[PDB]
């Protein structure tokens, strides 16, 4: 049940790939901002190498802090799948699986219309702790 997902996930060749890494000594993403073209197939590679032994995932949400909380809350109630957003979670565009320290996982999805979007980690307490970043989708 611990698997990638999201409304925008697709099985197509990526036009672009981008790597995101976890901060090694903090509950954060090493990259707090991303930039991608709209309605483009992209493969996001999340590399979770950290010195805390902690799990992390990468979750792109259809909106901001308020939408992020709903997704994160839906995730909080999904321990059986290692706290990834449940499938068909509203406003969850794309997510990687929940990764142990030392693990790497990807998600391939079509970027949404141009706009600003938060990406967060839904493992319990990380989002509140500030593990998030902003995705800007251009024309
Ligand atoms: Cl933790
Ligand atoms: Cu995390």
From Swiss-Prot:
UniProt: Cu cation binding residues: 56, 121, 126, 131
Highest taxon above the source species: Bacteria
Domain Plastocyanin-like residue range list: 15-139
Protein name in the entry: Auracyanin-B-2
Organism in which the protein naturally occurs: Chloroflexus aurantiacus (strain ATCC 29366 / DSM 635 / J-10-fl)
């Amino acid at each position: 049940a611990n698997a990638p997902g999201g409304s925008n996930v697709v099985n197509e060749t990526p036009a672009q790939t981008v790597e995101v890494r976890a901060a090694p000594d903090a509950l954060a993403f090493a990259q707090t901002s991303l930039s991608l073209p709209a309605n483009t197939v992209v493969r996001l590679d999340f590399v979770n190498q950290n010195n805390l032994g902690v799990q992390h995932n990468w979750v792109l949400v259809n909106g901001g802090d308020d939408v992020a909380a709903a997704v994160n809350t839906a995730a909080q109630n999904n321990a059986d799948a290692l706290f990834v957003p449940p499938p068909d979670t509203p406003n969850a565009l794309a997510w990687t699986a929940m990764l142990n320290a030392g693990e790497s996982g990807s998600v391939t999805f079509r970027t949404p219309a141009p706009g600003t979007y938060l990406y967060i980690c839904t493992f319990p307490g990380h989002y509140l702790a500030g593990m998030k970043g902003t995705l800007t989708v251009t024309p």
